[PDB]
Structure 1
Amino acid sequence: LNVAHGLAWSYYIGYLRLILPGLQARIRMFNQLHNNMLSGAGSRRLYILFPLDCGVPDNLSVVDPNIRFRDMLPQQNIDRAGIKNRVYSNSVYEILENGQPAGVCILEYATPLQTLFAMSQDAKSREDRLEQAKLFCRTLEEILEDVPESRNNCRLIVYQEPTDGNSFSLSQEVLRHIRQEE
């Protein structure tokens, strides 16, 4: 349709383009402080949760008994070529599998999906929201494909959280992605 394009571009321009080139330096800072806790597959990329249903939690953090908050990435004052950085909120979680920590992961939501959710809650549909969300995703995927540094430092985790039933597990989904990486 229309808004997906704008959402993808602004989310790149105003966020991903800004945070991705400084991420590894901040992972390094985090690992120096926290005895290499950010180690193992899936631990050194920004994983962006992209629920096509657009269910981003209000408070933006992952809320899930099997995805346990541990810590946030520290900040880097100055970027690689001497330009001052803004500040970024990035959270590191441990993924549980049967009560046992199975991985550590920098996880967050693709925040603009909230905008799509809001649009579908005004008196002036959900299937349109889904199509918009998909288009938002593939447009973002195309953009990242054009910058090879970015694609190295982040992965999109695209799924659909059903509105009811107990079939879907986000933690297993995140594990599924990391373990299948090649």
Structure 2
Amino acid sequence: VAHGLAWSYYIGYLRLILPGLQARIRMFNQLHNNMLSGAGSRRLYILFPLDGVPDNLSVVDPNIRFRDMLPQQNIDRAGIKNRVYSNSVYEILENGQPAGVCILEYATPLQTLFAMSQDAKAGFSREDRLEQAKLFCRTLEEILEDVPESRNNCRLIVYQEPTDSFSLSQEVLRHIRQ
């Protein structure tokens, strides 16, 4: 199931959104004294926690600080027709210092995976959901690897949360640094 879900995420969102990302950064930077930086901050980072319903990003971590919206993106495929999309820019702290600035969001298909799992008749366990989550990521990673213009503009950030000291900020930083 998660195979077609990763494809619809790519086809139905990442394809529409990536190509104009850089231009929107350029603006953002004109208007915020070059807050985005070089290379690290030139990507759309998609968060995919493994372990449903992660904390929303404004509250998840005191070291992940919202700054501002990029300028909106207008789309006009023969969709759909006219659509407006938003993306959000976050300051990422390490040791009390601004260590990174980036565009960051959760993968919407989490919501579908969760909703699937919660359905009364055909819902399924946490373990079965994790198996699907892993399959979504593996499949999305493959798609992106095959598409250099897409891959140069975004990175899937996949992580597991221990219920048992987890900092999402340190995870994002490690990716941003790689």
Does the CA contact (< 8 Å) of 1:22 and 1:79 recur in 2?
no
Is the alpha carbon distance of 1:161 and 1:65 closer, same or farther for their aligned partners in structure 2, counting shifts above 3 Å? Answer: same
Counterpart Cα distance in 1 of 2:149 and 2:26: 17
Tell me which residue corresponds to 1:143. Answer: 143
| Deviation at residue 52 of structure 1 after TM alignment | 1.4
Pairs aligned (count): 175
Q: Is the 8 A contact 1:40 1:103 kept in 2?
A: no
Tell me, yes or no, if the aligned pair for 1:4 and 1:135 is still in contact at 8 Å. yes
Aligned partners of 1:123, 1:62: CA distance in 2, in Å? 30
Q: 1:88 to 1:82 in 2, by over 3 A?
A: closer
How far the C-alpha of 1:9 sits from its partner, in A, is 1.1
Aligned CA distance change for structure 1 residues 78 and 138 (closer, same or farther; 3 Å): closer
| CA positional deviation for 1:60 | 6.8
CA distance 1:145–1:62, shift in 2 (3 Å): farther
**Structure 2 SS opposite 1:108:** strand
CA distance in 2, matches of 1:143, 1:62: 31
Q: Within 1, Cα distance between the matches of 2:112 and 2:166?
A: 24
SS in 2 for 1:177: helix
- CA separation of 1:60/1:118 partners in 2, compared to 1, >3 Å: closer, same or farther? farther
Provide the rounded CA distance (Å) in 2 between the counterparts of 1:31 and 1:80.
Answer: 27
Give me the identity figure in percent. 100
Unaligned 5+ runs, structure 1? none
* Alpha-carbon distance change, 38 to 141 in structure 1, aligned in 2, over 3 angstroms: same
CA distance in 1 between counterparts of 2:61 and 2:85 reads 22
Q: Is the 8 A contact 1:78 1:84 kept in 2?
A: yes
Query: Using a 3 Å threshold, how does the CA distance of structure 1 residues 146 and 81 change in structure 2: closer, same or farther?
Result: farther
Whole-Å Cα distance in 1 between the matches of residues 149 and 77 of structure 2?
14
Higher strand share: 2
User: For the aligned residues, what is the CA RMSD?
Assistant: 2.8
Q: Which runs of 5+ in 2 are unaligned?
A: none
Corresponding residue to 2:71 among 66, 70, 74: 74
Alignment partners' CA distance in 2, 1:122 and 1:58: 21
